[PDB]
Design a protein around this ligand. Structure first.
Ligand SMILES: *[C@@H]1O[C@H](CO)[C@@H](O[C@@H]2O[C@H](CO)[C@@H](O[C@H]3O[C@H](CO)[C@@H](O)[C@H](O)[C@@H]3O)[C@H](O)[C@H]2NC(C)=O)[C@H](O)[C@H]1NC(C)=O
Ligand SMILES: *[C@@H]1O[C@H](CO)[C@@H](O[C@@H]2O[C@H](CO)[C@@H](O[C@H]3O[C@H](CO)[C@@H](O)[C@H](O)[C@@H]3O)[C@H](O)[C@H]2NC(C)=O)[C@H](O)[C@H]1NC(C)=O
Ligand SMILES: *[C@@H]1O[C@H](CO)[C@@H](O[C@@H]2O[C@H](CO)[C@@H](O[C@H]3O[C@H](CO)[C@@H](O)[C@H](O)[C@@H]3O)[C@H](O)[C@H]2NC(C)=O)[C@H](O)[C@H]1NC(C)=O
Ligand SMILES: *[C@@H]1O[C@H](CO)[C@@H](O[C@@H]2O[C@H](CO)[C@@H](O[C@H]3O[C@H](CO)[C@@H](O)[C@H](O)[C@@H]3O)[C@H](O)[C@H]2NC(C)=O)[C@H](O)[C@H]1NC(C)=O
Ligand SMILES: *[C@@H]1O[C@H](CO)[C@@H](O[C@@H]2O[C@H](CO)[C@@H](O[C@H]3O[C@H](CO)[C@@H](O)[C@H](O)[C@@H]3O)[C@H](O)[C@H]2NC(C)=O)[C@H](O)[C@H]1NC(C)=O
Ligand SMILES: *[C@@H]1O[C@H](CO)[C@@H](O[C@@H]2O[C@H](CO)[C@@H](O[C@H]3O[C@H](CO)[C@@H](O)[C@H](O)[C@@H]3O)[C@H](O)[C@H]2NC(C)=O)[C@H](O)[C@H]1NC(C)=O
Ligand SMILES: *[C@@H]1O[C@H](CO[C@@H]2O[C@@H](C)[C@@H](O)[C@@H](O)[C@@H]2O)[C@@H](O[C@@H]2O[C@H](CO)[C@@H](O)[C@H](O)[C@H]2NC(C)=O)[C@H](O)[C@H]1NC(C)=O
Ligand SMILES: *[C@@H]1O[C@H](CO)[C@@H](O)[C@H](O)[C@H]1NC(C)=O
Ligand SMILES: *[C@@H]1O[C@H](CO)[C@@H](O)[C@H](O)[C@H]1NC(C)=O
Ligand SMILES: *[C@@H]1O[C@H](CO)[C@@H](O)[C@H](O)[C@H]1NC(C)=O
Ligand SMILES: *[C@@H]1O[C@H](CO)[C@@H](O)[C@H](O)[C@H]1NC(C)=O
Lengths: 240, 40, 339, 47
């Protein structure tokens, strides 16, 4: 688990050393603010129907009365160019806010905790996450358990043994085709079916697909070895 | 020998799952995965 | 999950086939590029929203031909071969119950001149330079992603979200669910025929409800109506004078000399350019709401379909067992199953 | 039962506790062993 983690942190380091486009989420947020400002500077070149775009050229080539008629155009056009920029920036700010509230929620639920939410803290079952800073953003390195090498087994919802029906306390029943075991749900580690591994409810007539196998009682060989102890002690007490 | 192709996009590789009323698959092993996620 | 992608040709809307008007429109600078860019940004985002909501699997899961799901009858929500697109029974109700104003699929003119032109308004939008663009994922590919999510859910539990699809019998998946809501798994097996008959009956109530009332899909129909009303309003503004002598660009040019015509034309340019900047601002604000709805739908796809949720009232009313996605026009329907 | 429950502390500290028996499944499993042992000891008086 340590070697797989250390190797996966190595793959992140090499991936970030190799491709450009992965940080496009942040670079696009820098590019949009830069493009919006480049556009707002370019609008200072528009005439808006005045005789010139250059404010000093209007004011130097015309007297007060017809100059107000030319300048009012440049004011009206430029003012709409600011209101367009500010409306666009309020709509982007509303997006960045939503992304920041998502990032605050992932900081709280993936870094300060562990999440049961599927695919929220990366793909796989969430173990933990590590935050990293980036220009205008946060990178989360999510660490996740992915189940990797499956085998098929035959399974049953229940075991019938002593006429009564048995169910796993935690995990699931499996068979290799010859013997039966409990195992935990998310990793194959088989164990003998026992009165500690299983709980009992009702008789085996009602459960669809129930199977016959023995359920072992771990107390039975404690008492039966204590019976062979008692039997040899009674047999010995015939001798003196 | 290179050009613009055009095609119907694939959604993903097809993978029918080996279901039965009595068959289960259980993982004998795991891989710790680290994945980067990037937020503005 | 999405809304109709729209491109508006700013020069053709403001200055339709007049170079006199086009040379005046150039004096307003980069505004038509800002408008084209903003609507392109929305249109790209409608595919992203649809990818985030539906494309949560890299593998396309196919259901077995035998339907031994422990008595649970998914035949209303799985695909049927009898229809030339792989939609479920319930999805073919959803695609009928929302009226879809312009899908964008080729206006060949034989459909858009003559008798139909006297009754169809979409051709007037198109002729004024307003065009609806098709989604990247058509209703067949959305039906296949939804089929794969549902096939994965009924065949493999939650595991296809975590990693490989691991088969499990459906009655054992439902037991793992029951343990998830704190009900002991013997309660499923001792009642399995009842739990199956109730699920089958509840899917029956969904089918009959969707067959009966209109208003339930208003969540999707009013997103179509808002985009349709916004474009009808944008077409209507070509009737406004804005204080010019005429609403009609050719009429102004038919009667006035160069020096006097420009004072009338630049009124229409100024009023129509406001009429676009209102439409594009309104569509960006709509796009910001549909985005939030697509992020919510992607979060419900991840937490209600690819999993089981402990979050109260997030995946339906009641304690969450599982949920089945179904495709709809511009949307997703979740069938949440709850104890 | 002792499988269905866990013990901590005495009965004085818990507000609203009730008296009832809690069954130990090991007790009658050993009590049939006491009756087995009793009949075996008494049978060993007969030969
Ligand atoms: C299903 O799981 C069973 C339990 O793991 C397994 O049975 C076990 O098989 C091993 C041999 O592979 C036996 O080990 C003994 O084998 C010989 C017996 O003479 C000895 O030389 C060895 O030292 C060792 O004691 C286990 O005893 C046996 N367990 C039982 C209860 O029979 C099955 O083989 C598995 N079946 C399949 C199809 O995989
Ligand atoms: C699982 O193990 C069970 C116990 O060994 C076994 O139950 C036994 O099944 C037989 C056949 O059904 C019953 O035999 C009786 O059948 C009818 C009356 O119901 C009569 O015609 C017969 O003469 C006979 O009385 C046994 O009574 C029954 N035992 C018990 C304790 O119920 C199951 O059949 C096994 N099932 C599998 C799938 O392995
Ligand atoms: C569970 O999956 C593990 C992989 O994530 C796997 O570990 C890998 O095991 C093999 C041997 O079985 C190792 O192979 C290398 O072994 C040495 C170098 O150490 C060389 O001589 C070989 O040629 C070969 O390169 C892998 O290095 C090893 N990987 C890791 C990260 O330890 C486990 O074996 C799997 N466990 C089970 C029970 O299946
Ligand atoms: C799973 O649920 C399905 C929906 O209830 C069900 O399909 C329905 O089956 C009935 C019975 O065949 C059909 O009723 C018609 O059946 C024949 C047709 O020739 C006539 O004799 C009857 O009068 C009646 O018209 C339903 O129409 C049919 N519904 C659909 C949408 O196909 C499946 O049979 C169920 N499968 C299982 C395994 O439970
Ligand atoms: C738990 O709630 C169940 C309802 O969700 C309830 O199931 C219903 O039980 C009644 C009988 O008690 C059945 O009534 C019908 O029975 C036959 C037709 O099959 C007719 O002769 C009757 O007139 C009547 O129509 C219902 O069909 C049945 N509903 C379902 C979905 O199976 C259980 O009885 C309740 N269980 C407990 C332990 O309270
Ligand atoms: C549940 O059962 C308990 C025992 O079966 C019982 O406790 C008993 O309570 C009485 C009265 O409080 C005690 O009697 C003693 O009272 C004082 C000393 O505290 C003396 O005057 C008496 O002579 C006598 O010693 C018992 O000693 C006490 N025994 C035990 C084992 O607790 C609880 O009261 C019962 N609970 C309820 C709610 O009734
Ligand atoms: C798990 O089982 C499936 C299919 O069931 C098995 O099919 C036989 C091969 C035999 O093992 C039966 O007793 C089982 O019922 C396996 O899926 C097959 O995989 C091969 C490639 O290995 C492929 O060519 C087949 O088309 C698949 N068949 C089906 C029905 O899907 C699967 O390989 C098994 N998993 C593992 C990890 O072994
Ligand atoms: C499983 O399906 C087979 C038919 O393919 C059937 O014979 C068997 O009885 C079924 N078992 C259960 C528990 O459904
Ligand atoms: C039998 O009991 C006597 C007690 O006097 C003891 O000496 C002897 O070792 C016992 N034998 C066995 C086999 O226990
Ligand atoms: C519960 O309330 C009643 C009065 O309504 C009181 O007599 C009783 O002692 C209370 N029991 C507990 C456990 O608080
Ligand atoms: C008593 O013990 C003897 C063996 O010493 C045996 O033959 C007899 O059947 C026993 N009786 C009982 C009731 O156990």
């Amino acid at each position: 688990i340590a070697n797989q983690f250390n190797s996966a942190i190595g793959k992140i380091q090499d991936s970030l050393s190799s491709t450009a486009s992965a940080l496009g989420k942040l670079q696009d947020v820098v590019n949009q603010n830069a493009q919006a400002l480049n556009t707002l500077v370019k609008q200072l070149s528009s005439n808006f129907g005045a005789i010139s775009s250059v404010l000093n050229d209007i004011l130097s080539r015309l007297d007060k009365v017809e100059a107000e008629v030319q300048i009012d155009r440049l004011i009206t056009g430029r003012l709409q160019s600011l209101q367009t920029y500010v409306t666009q920036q309020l709509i982007r700010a509303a997006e960045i806010r939503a992304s920041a509230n998502l990032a605050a929620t992932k900081m709280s639920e993936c870094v300060l905790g562990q999440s049961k939410r599927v695919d929220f803290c990366g793909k796989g079952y969430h173990l933990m996450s590590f935050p990293q800073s980036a220009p205008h953003g946060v990178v989360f390195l999510h660490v996740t358990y992915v189940p990797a090498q499956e085998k098929n087994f035959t399974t049953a919802p229940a075991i019938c043994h002593d006429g009564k029906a048995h169910f796993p306390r935690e995990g699931v029943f499996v068979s290799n085709g010859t013997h039966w075991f409990v195992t935990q749900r998310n990793f194959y580690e088989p164990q003998i079916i026992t009165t500690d591994n299983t709980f009992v409810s009702g008789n085996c007539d009602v459960v669809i697909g129930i199977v016959n196998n023995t359920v072992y009682d771990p107390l039975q060989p404690e008492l039966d070895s204590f019976k062979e102890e008692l039997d040899k002690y009674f047999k010995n007490h015939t001798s003196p | 020998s290179q050009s613009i192709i055009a095609y119907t996009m694939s959604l993903g590789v097809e993978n029918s799952v080996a279901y039965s009323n009595n068959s289960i698959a259980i993982p004998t092993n795991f891989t710790i995965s680290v994945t980067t996620e990037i937020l503005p | 999950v999405s809304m109709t992608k729209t491109s508006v040709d700013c020069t053709m809307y403001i200055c339709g086939d007049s170079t006199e008007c086009s040379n005046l429109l150039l004096q307003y600078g980069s505004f038509c590029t800002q408008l084209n860019r903003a609507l392109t940004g929305i249109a790209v985002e409608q595919d992203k929203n649809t990818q985030e909501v539906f494309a949560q699997v890299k593998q396309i899961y196919k259901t077995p031909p035998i339907k031994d799901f422990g008595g649970f009858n998914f035949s209303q929500i799985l695909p049927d071969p009898s229809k030339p697109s792989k939609r479920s029974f319930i999805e073919d109700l959803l695609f009928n119950k929302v009226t879809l104003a312009d899908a964008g699929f080729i206006k060949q003119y034989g459909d858009c001149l003559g008798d139909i032109a006297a009754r169809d308004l979409i051709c007037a939008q198109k002729f004024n330079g307003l065009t609806v663009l098709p989604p990247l994922l058509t209703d067949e590919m959305i039906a296949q992603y939804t089929s794969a999510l549902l096939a994965g859910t009924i065949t493999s539990g939650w595991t296809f979200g975590a990693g490989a699809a691991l088969q499990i019998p459906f009655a054992m998946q439902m037991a793992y669910r029951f343990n998830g809501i704190g009900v002991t798994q013997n309660v499923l097996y001792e009642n399995q025929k009842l739990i199956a008959n109730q699920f089958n009956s509840a899917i029956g109530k969904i089918q009959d409800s969707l067959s009966s009332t209109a208003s339930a899909l208003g969540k999707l129909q009013d997103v179509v109506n808002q985009n349709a009303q916004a474009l009808n309003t944008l077409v209507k503004q070509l009737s406004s004078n804005f204080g010019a002598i005429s609403s009609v660009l050719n009429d102004i040019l038919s009667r006035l000399d160069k020096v006097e015509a420009e004072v009338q034309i630049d009124r229409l340019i100024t009023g129509r350019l406001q009429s676009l900047q209102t439409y594009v601002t309104q569509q960006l604000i709509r796009a910001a709401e549909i985005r939030a709805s697509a992020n919510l739908a992607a979060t419900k796809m991840s937490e209600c379909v690819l999993g089981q949720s402990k979050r109260v009232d997030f995946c339906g009313k009641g304690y969450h067992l599982m949920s089945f996605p179904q495709s709809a026009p511009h949307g997703v329907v979740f069938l949440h199953v709850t104890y």
